[PDB]
Design a binder for this molecule. Structure first.
Ligand SMILES: Nc1nc2c(ncn2[C@@H]2O[C@H](COP(=O)(O)OP(=O)(O)NP(=O)(O)O)[C@@H](O)[C@H]2O)c(=O)[nH]1
Ligand SMILES: Nc1nc2c(ncn2[C@@H]2O[C@H](COP(=O)(O)OP(=O)(O)NP(=O)(O)O)[C@@H](O)[C@H]2O)c(=O)[nH]1
Ligand SMILES: [Mg+2]
Ligand SMILES: [Mg+2]
Lengths: 167, 54, 54, 169
């Protein structure tokens, strides 16, 4: 099993560090906006099945780009990430969900992720508002920190499990 | 020596035009990248793997 | 509003700073392009043909 | 049959991209933008009884180190080193271009020095005889071309292919 998973959401929310945390257990306090498109992999054992996650990443830019179709093409999973310290990143989440469904295949498993949980003091999005939006739209929901690690394995592994349950 | 108001204002005008040209060329580079990556993603997506493994 | 000398100069300093960041970004984009093309040229050079044949 | 890799080299603005489009596509553009990246186009001629494909590469004429330089020259059997005959500076730097060429290709690669933009010759800054003489003294072919009106564009690339072919057989 190889499951293509995409990372979507605003610039700055932590997509690239969630990728590097999950796939290499590495984090960079410095990272700049991503150029182009890349992917990294991690393979887990689910029951008795080896499952490779092939997780794609690009800058969270709202404008039209040529790569958008091919980015979403064949994806069976998505993490739609906002920064829980930045309310603008959450407000705009219905717009990303719009894009996902325009390009994504029908059976895509979607998890809404509020990243930067380690910055609880600068929080601008209540867990509750985000959970309910997720529940209303049939999306999974978690809060993570790529920085300290909280829920990062759980977030990617829960998506892979739900994909695996379907396939 | 101290620049006059008009000398400072000319420098600002010149910098505004340079900024416009730089923004134009950034989008040309970004558009090149995007058009190239469409071909890569479709033909040989392993090139996009991090870390790279030839 | 007729900007004062200090307001013009501040607008200039801000543009100068914007320019430095735009120049760094341009070189980041150019380096990305060069590094990607190295791999394309090694593995699948037909991607670079004009006109393109998939 | 044969595939000969040929590179275009020389200063930004001399007309490399337009010589390539004019030969391989019979197209020309007034757009003055520097080339981004690296591209190649092909044209196949018959030399004697062989079908010979010219695979001609293009990139911007930048002096600075670039990651793509080695792979750009790798495997090349010919080079057109181009200048703008209306801009003396583009000619003055020809020997720096040859130096770079011979850091990446064998010393006896077939090379043509090309003085491009001949339809602008009312504004010539490089004498035909002077560049012809330089080409002769350095073992280079030479021609003046115009990618805009086509003058000598076919001859320039077909002469390079003919020499490579002679040398290879
Ligand atoms: N405190 C904290 N910082 C984080 C966390 N995740 C990412 N960051 C920091 O947030 C900044 C942006 O992270 P990055 O992963 O590059 O964001 P991105 O979503 O990929 N941005 P873009 O879409 O432009 O490429 C970085 O300085 C990074 O170190 C986190 O969980 N906690
Ligand atoms: N009149 C005339 N103009 C030409 C000729 N060749 C190219 N040009 C024009 O000269 C300018 C630059 O040509 P171009 O082919 O882009 O040059 P280049 O050598 O590829 N430049 P770079 O190395 O930066 O990519 C363009 O505006 C082009 O239309 C020519 O033979 N005659
Ligand atoms: Mg990123
Ligand atoms: Mg060019």
């Amino acid at each position: 099993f190889v499951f293509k998973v995409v990372l979507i959401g605003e610039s700055g929310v932590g997509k690239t560090n969630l990728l590097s945390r999950f796939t290499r257990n590495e984090f960079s306090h410095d990272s700049r906006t991503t150029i182009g498109v890349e992917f990294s992999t991690r393979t887990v054992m689910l029951g008795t099945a080896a499952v490779k996650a092939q997780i794609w990443d690009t800058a969270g830019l709202e404008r039209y780009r040529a790569i958008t179709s091919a980015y979403y093409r064949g994806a069976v999973g998505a993490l739609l990430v906002f920064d829980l310290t930045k309310h603008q990143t959450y407000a705009v989440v219905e717009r990303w969900l719009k894009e996902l469904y325009d390009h994504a295949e029908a059976t895509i498993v979607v998890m809404l992720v509020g990243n930067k949980s380690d910055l609880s003091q600068a929080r601008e999005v209540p867990t509750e508002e985000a959970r309910m939006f997720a529940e209303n739209n049939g999306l999974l929901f978690l809060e993570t920190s790529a920085l300290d690690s909280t829920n990062v394995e759980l977030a990617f592994e829960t998506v892979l499990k739900e994909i695996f349950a379907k396939v | 020596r101290s620049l006059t108001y008009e000398e400072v204002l000319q420098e600002l005008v010149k910098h505004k035009e340079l900024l416009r040209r730089k923004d134009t060329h950034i989008r040309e580079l970004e558009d090149y990248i995007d058009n190239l990556l469409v071909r890569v993603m479709e033909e040989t997506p392993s090139i996009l793997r991090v870390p790279y493994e030839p």
